[PDB]
Write an enzyme that holds these catalytic residues in place. Structure first.
Site, PDB file in Angstrom:
ATOM      1  N   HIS A   1       0.849  -1.224   0.000  1.00  0.00           N
ATOM      2  CA  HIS A   1       0.000   0.000   0.000  1.00  0.00           C
ATOM      3  C   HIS A   1       0.873   1.259   0.000  1.00  0.00           C
ATOM      4  O   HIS A   1       0.734   2.129   0.869  1.00  0.00           O
ATOM      5  CB  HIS A   1      -0.999  -0.053   1.143  1.00  0.00           C
ATOM      6  CG  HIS A   1      -2.146  -0.974   0.904  1.00  0.00           C
ATOM      7  ND1 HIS A   1      -2.258  -2.180   1.550  1.00  0.00           N
ATOM      8  CD2 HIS A   1      -3.245  -0.851   0.130  1.00  0.00           C
ATOM      9  CE1 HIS A   1      -3.363  -2.776   1.157  1.00  0.00           C
ATOM     10  NE2 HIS A   1      -3.973  -1.997   0.276  1.00  0.00           N
TER      11      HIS A   1
ATOM     12  N   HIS B   1       1.803   1.526  -5.755  1.00  0.00           N
ATOM     13  CA  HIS B   1       0.368   1.136  -5.792  1.00  0.00           C
ATOM     14  C   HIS B   1      -0.479   2.351  -6.196  1.00  0.00           C
ATOM     15  O   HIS B   1      -1.278   2.223  -7.107  1.00  0.00           O
ATOM     16  CB  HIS B   1      -0.047   0.554  -4.447  1.00  0.00           C
ATOM     17  CG  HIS B   1      -1.510   0.345  -4.381  1.00  0.00           C
ATOM     18  ND1 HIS B   1      -2.127  -0.569  -5.195  1.00  0.00           N
ATOM     19  CD2 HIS B   1      -2.469   0.874  -3.598  1.00  0.00           C
ATOM     20  CE1 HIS B   1      -3.426  -0.607  -4.901  1.00  0.00           C
ATOM     21  NE2 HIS B   1      -3.684   0.300  -3.963  1.00  0.00           N
TER      22      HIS B   1
ATOM     23  N   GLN C   1      -6.354 -17.466  -3.535  1.00  0.00           N
ATOM     24  CA  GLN C   1      -6.393 -16.673  -4.807  1.00  0.00           C
ATOM     25  C   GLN C   1      -7.606 -17.063  -5.666  1.00  0.00           C
ATOM     26  O   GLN C   1      -8.375 -16.133  -6.086  1.00  0.00           O
ATOM     27  CB  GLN C   1      -5.026 -16.735  -5.514  1.00  0.00           C
ATOM     28  CG  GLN C   1      -3.931 -15.915  -4.803  1.00  0.00           C
ATOM     29  CD  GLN C   1      -4.243 -14.435  -4.894  1.00  0.00           C
ATOM     30  OE1 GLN C   1      -4.314 -13.841  -5.965  1.00  0.00           O
ATOM     31  NE2 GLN C   1      -4.609 -13.857  -3.763  1.00  0.00           N
TER      32      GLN C   1
HETATM   33  C1  JIP Z   1      -4.589 -10.066  -5.606  1.00  0.00           C
HETATM   34  C2  JIP Z   1      -5.350  -9.266  -4.549  1.00  0.00           C
HETATM   35  N1  JIP Z   1      -5.525  -8.024  -4.724  1.00  0.00           N
HETATM   36  C3  JIP Z   1      -6.154  -7.320  -3.742  1.00  0.00           C
HETATM   37  C4  JIP Z   1      -6.593  -7.824  -2.557  1.00  0.00           C
HETATM   38  C5  JIP Z   1      -7.327  -6.979  -1.525  1.00  0.00           C
HETATM   39  N2  JIP Z   1      -6.364  -9.203  -2.414  1.00  0.00           N
HETATM   40  N3  JIP Z   1      -6.703 -10.003  -1.454  1.00  0.00           N
HETATM   41  C6  JIP Z   1      -6.163 -11.260  -1.814  1.00  0.00           C
HETATM   42  C7  JIP Z   1      -6.247 -12.554  -1.043  1.00  0.00           C
HETATM   43  N4  JIP Z   1      -6.770 -12.308   0.327  1.00  0.00           N
HETATM   44  C8  JIP Z   1      -5.842 -11.805   1.383  1.00  0.00           C
HETATM   45  C9  JIP Z   1      -8.219 -11.957   0.364  1.00  0.00           C
HETATM   46  N5  JIP Z   1      -9.205 -12.818  -0.033  1.00  0.00           N
HETATM   47  C10 JIP Z   1     -10.451 -12.105   0.177  1.00  0.00           C
HETATM   48  C11 JIP Z   1     -11.731 -12.721  -0.164  1.00  0.00           C
HETATM   49  C12 JIP Z   1     -11.739 -14.049  -0.723  1.00  0.00           C
HETATM   50  C13 JIP Z   1     -12.959 -14.686  -1.027  1.00  0.00           C
HETATM   51  C14 JIP Z   1     -14.173 -13.985  -0.812  1.00  0.00           C
HETATM   52  C15 JIP Z   1     -14.160 -12.663  -0.310  1.00  0.00           C
HETATM   53  C16 JIP Z   1     -12.945 -12.016   0.040  1.00  0.00           C
HETATM   54  N6  JIP Z   1     -10.259 -10.789   0.669  1.00  0.00           N
HETATM   55  N7  JIP Z   1      -8.859 -10.689   0.837  1.00  0.00           N
HETATM   56  C17 JIP Z   1      -8.251  -9.466   1.369  1.00  0.00           C
HETATM   57  N8  JIP Z   1      -5.596 -11.274  -2.999  1.00  0.00           N
HETATM   58  C18 JIP Z   1      -5.709  -9.931  -3.382  1.00  0.00           C
HETATM   59 MG    MG Z   2      -7.221   1.184   0.405  1.00  0.00          MG
HETATM   60 ZN    ZN Z   3      -5.492   0.732  -2.921  1.00  0.00          ZN
END
Ligand code: JIP
Ligand code: MG
Ligand code: ZN
Length: 312
Positions: free
Chosen positions: A67, A71, A268
């Site tokens: 962040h 970014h 992922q």
């Molecule tokens: C590539 C990528 N770009 C941005 C962000 C914010 N993330 N977040 C992850 C993986 N991870 C930490 C994550 N999974 C879910 C999620 C998973 C299923 C359903 C709902 C929400 N939220 N978050 C924060 N990968 C990324």
């Molecule tokens: Mg933000």
């Molecule tokens: Zn951002």
């Protein structure tokens, strides 16, 4: 007058959705000014004020893994691509407001989620009960706009200025992923029942919110080697949060636990299927020239599937 130019490879590739701004930090201000000039005009901003604004924005991003200032600029480039592919759909004020919103959207981010700030009982969680960081990012944006010589909007009228700061506030609030799910659902419904209407201000707001989510998630829309190396930066923040949760005496959710790297590939898949694909699908339905973002996202889902099948 003084048109910014880029080397030929960047001049051509900056126009594409999958452009990577590269590892030369000192070229990123110039990449941003180039994009403002082409998506807005050489006239939108006084160069000296815009240069002073860019440099105080950069100073107010922190040296965290994901962040950070890179970014900011990456997210602004994705907005540039969307704007350039949809030349006639956006007012001059939106052109202006949206690139600034994207450059500013994670100002003074510390690498921790809203949810960590609430459990740590951070002062910001008391000042802003929801969208805690996003209200902070907009607050930091106003601060910088009010520093001496930094008012890039000073040629606008009281009411154009209020409109542009209101576009920026909504755009930054929209980057709170908690809010994305309902926004996309509403837009899916409005698209499908045929009620979506871009002269309806509250519809336009919804469409700019989704663009903000699309830009914000745009690492999933790069070439696989960019996507994959960016994923390491993302998890390096989440795992630090996981550690800090353990220090508060809280078992963190698996996506934030470094002892569960194993589950990243499957985490992922959930993320592409629950968040990214639905995001770029609805975006492509409302703004058809943004299809390359959906195509690149599906390409990257298929790379993560290969990682699970041990072919990668
Ligand atoms: C590539 C990528 N770009 C941005 C962000 C914010 N993330 N977040 C992850 C993986 N991870 C930490 C994550 N999974 C879910 C999620 C998973 C299923 C359903 C709902 C929400 N939220 N978050 C924060 N990968 C990324
Ligand atoms: Mg933000
Ligand atoms: Zn951002």
């Amino acid at each position: 007058l003084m048109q910014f130019t880029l080397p030929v490879r960047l001049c051509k590739e900056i126009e594409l959705f999958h452009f990577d701004i590269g590892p030369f930090e000192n070229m990123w201000p110039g990449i941003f000014v180039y994009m403002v000039h082409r998506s807005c005009g050489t006239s939108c901003f006084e160069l000296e004020k815009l240069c002073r604004f860019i440099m105080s924005v950069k100073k107010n991003y922190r040296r965290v893994p994901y962040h950070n200032w890179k970014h900011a600029v990456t997210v602004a480039h994705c907005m540039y691509a969307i704007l350039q592919n949809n030349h006639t759909l956006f007012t001059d004020l939106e052109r202006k407001g949206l690139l600034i919103a994207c450059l500013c959207h994670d100002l003074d981010h510390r690498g921790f989620s809203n949810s960590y700030l609430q459990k740590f009982d951070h002062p910001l969680a008391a000042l802003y009960s929801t969208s805690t960081m996003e209200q902070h990012h907009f607050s930091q944006t106003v601060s910088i706009l009010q520093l001496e010589g930094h008012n890039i909007f000073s040629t606008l009228s009281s009411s154009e200025y209020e409109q542009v700061l209101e576009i920026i506030r909504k755009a930054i609030i929209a980057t709170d992923l908690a809010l994305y799910f309902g926004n996309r659902k509403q837009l899916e419904e409005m698209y499908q029942t045929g009620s979506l209407n871009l002269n309806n201000q509250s519809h336009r707001d919804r469409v700019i919110g989704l663009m903000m989510t699309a830009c914000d998630l745009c690492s999933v829309t790069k070439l696989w080697p960019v996507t994959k190396l960016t994923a390491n930066d993302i998890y390096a923040e989440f795992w630090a949060e996981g550690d800090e949760m353990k220090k508060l005496g809280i078992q963190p959710i698996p996506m934030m636990d470094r002892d569960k790297k194993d589950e990243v590939p499957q985490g992922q898949l959930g993320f592409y299927n629950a968040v990214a694909i639905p995001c770029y699908t609805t975006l492509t339905q409302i703004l058809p020239p943004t299809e390359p973002l959906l195509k690149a996202c599906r390409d990257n889902l298929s790379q993560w599937e290969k990682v699970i099948r041990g072919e990668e």
